[model samples]
Target: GLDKYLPGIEKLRRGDGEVEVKSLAGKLVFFYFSASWCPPCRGFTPQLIEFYDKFHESKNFEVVFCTWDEEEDGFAGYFAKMPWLAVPFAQSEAVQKLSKHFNVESIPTLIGVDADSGDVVTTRARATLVKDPEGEQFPWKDA
Candidate 1:
């Protein structure tokens, strides 16, 4: 299950804090594959943030940043602007494992998964969200 895969994660908060994967159990999870150095990622972040603001309130979803940044500073700076959780940059193993598991070869990719079983729902989650930012077609079952 996704919770078993993610033992501990850091929540992007005003002050540094951490949360367990169990906290997100039963919610749809958005694995945002991105990096601070990617120009496309920078451009899409605000749009993602906007989408998240609305979607998160539904209490059926969550986003977990899987950063590709090479430096801790880069990870920190980028995460500061996000309102979600992240696999700590210090946990390089977890980061690499997730990236490889999703076959993430590009930045700005958003992979949607079922939080309960870690089943991928969509690999083109970014595009799906962009097309329906209001989440009118949420769960994006067909994607």
Candidate 2:
């Protein structure tokens, strides 16, 4: 579960405030692995924002971003352009542990999880986003 990997992750950052981690229960949660300085993530992060803006309106989907950059390294600027919640850069080591738990191999990887049971829906949802931008065919399972 998210709680296991992120022990201090009581809340997720959104602007100057935060959202309780428990608030994500029953929603489709996406662990966004990215970096502001990375090229691929730069391209996808903005694109992901578009989909997030639309889906978040329904109140059924959520995102928890964990970028590879430090707070002083453009992390704030990147998140400024984003609308979803994210892990605070202060916990960089914890974020690294979470990345290891997911076996993250590349940047801009979207790891989908069923927040109810903490089960993985998909590990390669970057493709899923491109495949189903409108999300009209299925809920969040991408096989």
Candidate 3:
């Protein structure tokens, strides 16, 4: 199911013109959809960042942050602190359309997608973020 190319994700980016997820053309993509104002998101992002920093050096993965926040300045401020790529708030229409396709209903959600196949490996990676210590819960362990 993951063998299709996701045309939409291919378009994500930051304030700069860099293509988000370009480095992860053949690996796994962690679609971390969140908002800066959300309490849960505030708690989750730093942990995701820690995981991202670790995974990034290996180059075996890519992360594309989808935003629930709509303001570009706000998104930019948040992204400036992130070590990964993001889907700009300007592209909210496409992102929302995609989210509808996946039936996502919450912020701070993680969807693990197989980049090669364009299929989701885990639709609810958000759950694993808190449940698995060696995984998403790694940096958040003591917190």
Candidate 4:
């Protein structure tokens, strides 16, 4: 079984909650760890939003935003503008723990996982996410 669809701490739209990875089974879940204050993440937000908007229609994809910022106020401002799910800022520390679990060190990291196995398909999904206008499966296509 993959790690992608397994139940774990995930950030979702509306608020932070425990997500059933199997709920996303048959979908491509993008575990994106980011923060509004981080310069790199700020730069990437609009693009991520655009990509989210495009792929959002498919119902075959989802993005979970793990945060680096701390504070409900900050999280509120940021998540308000974003249409994707985000781990609560109060759970920032937990998100950090999750990042370590995934061996993620960089901010704005994208981890793509298959909903079925709950296993990560790719730890580095940045290029694939940013390059595609429609967030197409181009990266996997080439693979």
Candidate 5:
């Protein structure tokens, strides 16, 4: 049922344009919803960054940021500090669709899903990451 939404997902590459979802196929994808002005988001971003850097090179995991910022400048500034991909600021519809698809109701929510099948792996990824900073328990299986 969630498969229809998979192909349309796009991610912003650092210092470059958006890339296709196929680039991240077969990996554990983290759908990260956050905003620059959200206090909790600001605090958690660095933590997420650290976690990301630790695993990004492995090619088994990836994080795609979906911002809720109201201004383009804020989106750019906030994303500049992140080493992961993002839903581009210009693709507002894609961002909103992703948020709604995941039923995201708050900032700093991280959803882990199977990139190949669009199957949700964990809805409590933020907590999971916080508890296991080393990602020793990564690609958390469905409960």
Candidate 6:
């Protein structure tokens, strides 16, 4: 259902979880650009997980990590700690473009996208998530 959004990048790596991009259709998806060693990233990750925990199933929401780790081992080690999906390390070229297309300028950047139309719902998803970690004012919307 959300195949057009991912196009070439369909498979998601979540250790033991086998997921297809279609599962993200019409959902609020977060494209998380982060690395393992980033101090600030580490600080915010736990918070992100908690946020996802209560809402992923409660709402049509999904978070996919777009790794910024420079090596395979580090990528694996880092993604292992994550509770969501990721673009595999081997697809580094594809991964970089995911960042490039979104104008990713920093680490720990979370971009919220509307999977139905493939449009960005929020640029500062990290800030927005923190603003409402309880998800009370969720599905942050606009016309």
TM per prediction: 0.87, 0.89, 0.79, 0.76, 0.87, 0.89
With candidate 5 superimposed using the best TM-score fit, by how many Å does residue 41's alpha carbon deviate from the native? 1.2
Residues 26-75 of candidate 5: C-alpha lDDT, one tens digit per residue: 78788788887888987788898898887877847788888888798777
Runs with alpha carbons beyond 4 Å of true place in candidate 3: 1-11, 14-17, 20-22, 136-143
**Every model: Cα RMSD to truth:** 2.3, 1.8, 4.9, 3.5, 2.3, 1.9
Q: What is candidate 1's lDDT per residue for 4-81, written digit by digit as tens?
A: 455554243322777766777688888888887898887788888888887786747888888888887777777878
- The local lDDT score (0 to 100) that residue 102 gets in candidate 6 is 79
How accurate locally, in lDDT, is each candidate? 0.77, 0.79, 0.68, 0.67, 0.77, 0.80
Model 4 CA lDDT for position 31: 73
Evaluate model 2: give its TM-score: 0.89
Task: State the local distance difference test value for candidate 2.
Answer: 0.79
RMSD of 4: 3.5
Sorted on lDDT, best first, the list reads 6, 2, 1, 5, 3, 4
Candidate 3 per-residue C-alpha lDDT over 1-143 given as tens digits, one digit per residue, 9 for 90 to 100: 22233454555564466764555767777777888888898888887787677665564667777777776678777877777777667767767876777777888888877776776677766666667634643222211
| Clashing residue pairs, backbone N/CA/C < 3 A, model 6 | none
List of clashing residue pairs for candidate 2: none
Give the true-structure RMSD of model 2: 1.8
Q: What lDDT score is found at residue 43 in candidate 1?
A: 74
True-structure lDDT of candidate 1: 0.77
Model 5 lDDT on a 0 to 1 scale: 0.77
Model 6 per-residue lDDT tens digits across residues 44-74: 9999999888889888788988888887878
